[PDB]
Amino acid sequence: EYPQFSSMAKLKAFPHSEDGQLVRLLSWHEGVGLGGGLFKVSTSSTATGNDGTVVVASNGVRLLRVVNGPIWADMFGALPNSDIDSMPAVAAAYAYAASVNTDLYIGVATYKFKGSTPINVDPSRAGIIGYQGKVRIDCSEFTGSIVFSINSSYSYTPAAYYNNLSPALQGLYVFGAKTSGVDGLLVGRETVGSDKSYNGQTEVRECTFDKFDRNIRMGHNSWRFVFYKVNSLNALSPNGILYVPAGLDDSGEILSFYHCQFFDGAGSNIRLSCSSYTMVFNTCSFLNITFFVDSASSATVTCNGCNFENPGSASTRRYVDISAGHTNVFNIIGGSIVTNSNPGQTQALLYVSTDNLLNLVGVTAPYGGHYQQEQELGYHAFIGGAGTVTTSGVMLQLRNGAGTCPLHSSLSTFSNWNFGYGNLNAWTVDKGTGTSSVVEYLANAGPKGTEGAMRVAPVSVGTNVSQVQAVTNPGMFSMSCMVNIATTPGNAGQVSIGFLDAAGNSLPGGVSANLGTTTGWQVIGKNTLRGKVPIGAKQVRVNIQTVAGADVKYAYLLCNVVK
Amino acid sequence: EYPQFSSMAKLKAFPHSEDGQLVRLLSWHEGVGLGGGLFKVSTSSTATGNDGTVVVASNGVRLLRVVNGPIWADMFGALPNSDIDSMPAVAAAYAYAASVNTDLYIGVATYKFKGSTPINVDPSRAGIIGYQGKVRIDCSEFTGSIVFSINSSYSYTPAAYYNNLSPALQGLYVFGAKTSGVDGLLVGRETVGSDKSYNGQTEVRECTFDKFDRNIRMGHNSWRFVFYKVNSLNALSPNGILYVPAGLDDSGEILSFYHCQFFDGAGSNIRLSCSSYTMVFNTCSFLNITFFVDSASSATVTCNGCNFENPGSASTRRYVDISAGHTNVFNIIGGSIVTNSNPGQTQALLYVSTDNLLNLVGVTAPYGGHYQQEQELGYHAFIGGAGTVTTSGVMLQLRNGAGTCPLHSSLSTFSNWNFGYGNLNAWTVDKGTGTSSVVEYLANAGPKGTEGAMRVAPVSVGTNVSQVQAVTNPGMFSMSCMVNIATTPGNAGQVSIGFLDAAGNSLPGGVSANLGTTTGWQVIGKNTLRGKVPIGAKQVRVNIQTVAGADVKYAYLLCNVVK
Amino acid sequence: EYPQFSSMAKLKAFPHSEDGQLVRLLSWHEGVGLGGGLFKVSTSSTATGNDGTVVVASNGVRLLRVVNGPIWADMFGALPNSDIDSMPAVAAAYAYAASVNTDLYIGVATYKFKGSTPINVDPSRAGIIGYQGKVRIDCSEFTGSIVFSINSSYSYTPAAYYNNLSPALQGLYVFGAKTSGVDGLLVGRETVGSDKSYNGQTEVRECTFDKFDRNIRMGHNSWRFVFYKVNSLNALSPNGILYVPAGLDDSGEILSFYHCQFFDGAGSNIRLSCSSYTMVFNTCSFLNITFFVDSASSATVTCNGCNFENPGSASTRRYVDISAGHTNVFNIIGGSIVTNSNPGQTQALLYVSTDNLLNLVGVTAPYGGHYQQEQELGYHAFIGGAGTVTTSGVMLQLRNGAGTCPLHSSLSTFSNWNFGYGNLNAWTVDKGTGTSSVVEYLANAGPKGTEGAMRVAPVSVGTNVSQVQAVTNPGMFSMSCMVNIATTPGNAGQVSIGFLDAAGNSLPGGVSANLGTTTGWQVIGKNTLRGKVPIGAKQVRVNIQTVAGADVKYAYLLCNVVK
């Protein structure tokens, strides 16, 4: 005889007695066809009854489901595409799976998670895998603080052996309704435990988090998690795409993201605020959001082959804003930075504050005619802030018809470029025969009224102000200037850049910008003061010529040679 | 009771009537044992009959297969290791799977795809997964335009939630017979749709494409696809390993390749022709093929930790040819460039055209005695073209017994290195007491007849031509020269390189190369003019000594100091 | 009639006679419920029995298991959580799986592997997949030389089509008992085979190797393997975390590691000893172990986004030791280098030997008050060895209260920094009016007694020794010096660093360190001689002032400007 039973209730009611008998369950719920399987009668098992993988019959005899491979939620009575809250059945199935160090599968379908009780995934025991397709976890009615957390139950082993063997979460679209106070995923622990939680090597892959307060938030013990093909979008919090708060314990080692997409925040963004925290992003995209870094110290973010872009957006938000702290480093290596047109880009899209560093390697700096960064900076450049920028292998868009701009003040070719010395030192001021000509430093006379400017008012003959510095091939350059013509009898002058070899031979490839006749502060140089460093150049010379009878103020004479 | 039927045809013939009854199918095809399962009789179902997951019995009653997990092709009557065309059963199973947002599994075996109808995978609905092992999809008799295309049916959501949740293709060896007009995989769409297709985050993994016309071709909407462990080899088209044509719409954001192998093209290659297109290759290998970039503008390719090599090949093909356009950037960061011997490498293996940039970071430049790049360039260097090269952390093979060469013209240490000034300026020509010694610039007199040369024909005493430039530690250097001795009474002279500190102290370790006595254009410097920059060096001085009575032409005096 | 059999023994003993009949096996072992399935009776097949998928009944009739998808070890009688050796059943199941190009699954549980015969996985035919959870393979009683090896049976095809389609090993924790002579995983072949083995694209993922002699060792044909989420810890051999021995054939192309953790060796380490070998590590961590590179030539290791740290360890072991050979390159790009306090870090944590190169890109160099590298080097710097270091985008910890140090001798700003010229050249020695002041080079008089030193003993008025060099913004600097005051009448002097523009204007912010009055060799500069390069600086000047009546030796005047 090979007994078969049509439902879990009927299986449980029968007086099973023969040890080792195999009994078939057709379905967990009568008439559905899911959750069935083979069960072994055991009269001496100590296993806990759970109406799923261990059934205690009414006479006390245990029936042990024969499972090869993962546990499935339907083994505990979960149903696909049901209007009943599925979180209890998933939580019960997960508790069993974790207890036997086996992953839990959720069959592909839609599920509703209601109530307020989170699921804590223990990556040292079991992950939760949507199997396989577009598994939809509707948390729009969930009211708890977090839907999922991921945190090991151990301080060392066997987490050091087991976390890496299977993902913690895979294959799930998890979404809310942007209710204040409900977050999606907590990576680590809410509060500091008495002992550490060993979370290294834990993976979240092929999941989307959407429409939470914070979609993904790092907690304590957030270290060596890896994310592959994770999407985070449309969160409520200003920090809601991905938030790493300050003050985390036992956190920060190589948080890694491969081919993840952080996007369409509609006001939500990424913020890294924890000190001594190292994040690596490989082939990720950051779209219509800002990446803020305000850690007190020792944040290191590396973006290898990533894109930063504003697709379909009119927002002037920054792409990367390193705004506080010291010894914070942000690397952009390869990939792309793309700036679609908007009504006017009135602030720098990259910003690096004092004592911090933004490194650009092997990436092209974009240019667009809508660039208006001078509204923030006082002058036309791509990057703001008093930190440091470095370039290695950076390409400028030298053939862009709208222009090119320098990248940053810290890359200035010329000394006293902004008259910040408080005088005209480092510049040679050649009035020629014009003994009456006026050339004066003026405090608080530049574009913002808080910086110096050089006023040039030649009489009878023009005045030439110049500076020479060492350069060599290979390289490319762009210069911008702020100029304010007060009056002029025609073209007011020109700014020129030329190159010489070490013997004083003038090389081809000199460029020049005419000042014109329009009064008021304006940017000079966009599509003129740019080019490639000639092969054999050893010196670069800038010259500012102002004609007789013109009266011009100059500020922020910013050349960058990327080399 | 518990009814069972031995075939799909027998299941359909029975007059099922009891709503909710579960019925077992032993096998789809009688006697095979595959494709069976449990079916639920459903008297009110609106489901589409398909002889797979929805069966309409002879009396009109629907039976619904109870599926937990992915759909499998054998549920629709597909059979393994059959000579019958399996593409119709796979296409029918895929249409159903996609309609329910569930992936499709193909059981591991060999399959033949015939006919001319492609399968379009919609990554926002379902992927196709060979499960699990070496699944072989023989398309040698397929005559359609493409075997697989991958393109979303949606312009935004739910593609933005679903594409990342599962791969689009996994686990398949897909091959043709190199017939003209049959491509393997189309990434995106053939023609521009009235709305965009949201393809970001779609993955192809663990697949091989072989013996098609173009194995992998990008179409419109090709953006943020990721490829892992994908092999492409032995295509028919000259661009057949991976082709990105010009003019694609809505394409180019972070196309990403992890641990992919592009190889053994037997005349097929990679070509990137689309503008504003960004590709990232991590740990890939490019073997016995060329990577062409001819985008009109704004291509950015980053190769992190990749290998470029010619294993087992006698071909002189280039490894990387950035051949057209402007503002195109190609980065080689880490990894390796390996040049096995061939009968003579008569063109540069890397080429970067005017207005483009090739960045080398942390990689060793190889050298081999079969290098003969001067046949193309006119002079002995590793990289061709009028673009720019940068180096950061590049190692030269300074102990290579065959020699070492400079990398590129744009890294020239000395000014007027190729006599491109049209004169001998930047060089100090010291005739000593030799008042009748001849030293002259000759137009169109170098190796190619298109460049300048310097002729030195001293009388009574030798002539020394020198130049000094700034250098610093750390660094490594290699110089090559082209020399043509017309006549000489013995060794014609010597080229030397030495270093000084800023105070004029000569530092030990200078190097020198004899010119010898052989007539005709020859390369000087291979094993001689190379070394490390001494710690404390601040100047480098080159000197070319030509003896009395010799008559020698010099061209292309190319030194590179890698930092 | 759907016949059913309760065990493999009963299936074999029954007098089957009807050709083509499908019969059901409930379980391989009576009463277990695992390993059952459908079998097709064949009166014509004479296939060789294997008691798993091809079963020969006692009457000679063949019963052919109908399998869809992977082979499972329980189909051959393997049992979970058994005290019997499971290696024979896994090896028999694997041999069959490989023969049909199908992967082998091992159901999640614990297994004991005993005996001494390895399993050689052929990645061109079949992988072994623990499915799905924390699969535990206890090899504590295994006595063979290796547990698993991975090496293809083919020289070209179909390995070029198949290796990438599925992993070779996945999902397994494999552990020993640290018995001498028993290794865990051999990547490739033990000895040089008759033809090459085509191993490219083979993956090991989601596995842990623990407590072997060497946990992971490369053999011949080790090329283009990829490892994802692999852990290696607690090996017996000094090279036991990961060993690449010298002398391998057909090996070294792009061995790739993604998100792997190499850790807690308790005396075991990573060692790369093979020449012409290229390894790429992305988001890996190296914890409480050393990474040794002693390849004779042409090793290239790239670490992208990795961490090197000593968490919880008092050991002074190095992090990276490139100790031999030539033309070896090690890249650290992004990521972090973290140095938790210990009783005194008495050797350099990074070391690069002559003719080799260590490149640092976009990473912060740490500092700690426990740094005592001068005990090894003779002077206070972070990196040892006579090789070369480069920096690009490197951050120094300028706000670290304990100090900052220079990175390496090869980055010396000043010439004759260590008196290695054998004289005082490159330094300006201004005795002022002090005609009797003594300033002299002394051989074998520095900290180690094997290097030069400069002794300054001024009479009546102080002596100032200075040097000037070119610098530019942006940059950061740190200088250390070794000083030995023999006698002094008060503060012995000061070392100062200042900046000028190209016109000789002194820029604000110079720094200085007093020498004090303590006798004996000491480090000067830690928290004093450091800072940012002023924007507009073009020269840096160091000055060493020694007061009248003092008698002081100076050595190792090491400034580094990271530009």
Numbering used by the authors:
A (entry chain C), B (entry chain B), C (entry chain A): 15 to 577
Reported in the publication:
The recombinant K2-2 was crystallized in a monoclinic P21 unit cell with the asymmetric unit containing two trimers of the enzyme, which were virtually identical. The crystal structure of K2-2 was solved at 1.38 Å resolution. The structure of K2-2 exhibits a compact trimeric architecture with a length of ~112 Å and a diameter of ~75 Å in its widest region. The particle-binding domain (residues 15–85) folds into a barrel-like structure consisting of a four-stranded β-sheet and a two-turn α-helix. The receptor-binding domain (residues 86–420) of each monomer folds into a right-handed β-helix composed of 9 complete rungs, with an N-terminal four-turn α-helix (residues 101–114) capping the lumen of the β-helix. In the trimer, three β-helices are packed laterally through β-sheets, forming a parallel left-handed superhelix with a hydrophilic channel at the center. The interior of the channel features a triangular interaction network consisting of three inter-chain hydrogen bonds and three intra-chain salt bridges made by three pairs of Glu217 and Arg219, each from a different subunit. The C-terminal domain (residues 421–577) of each monomer is organized into a β-sandwich topology, consisting of two antiparallel six-stranded β-sheets, plus an N-terminal one-turn α-helix. Therefore, we decided to use inactive mutants of the enzyme for subsequent soaking and co-crystallization experiments. By analyzing the surface properties of the receptor-binding domain of the enzyme, we discovered a prominent negatively charged cavity located at the intersubunit interface, formed by the conserved carboxylate triad Asp278-Glu323-Glu267* (*from adjacent subunit).
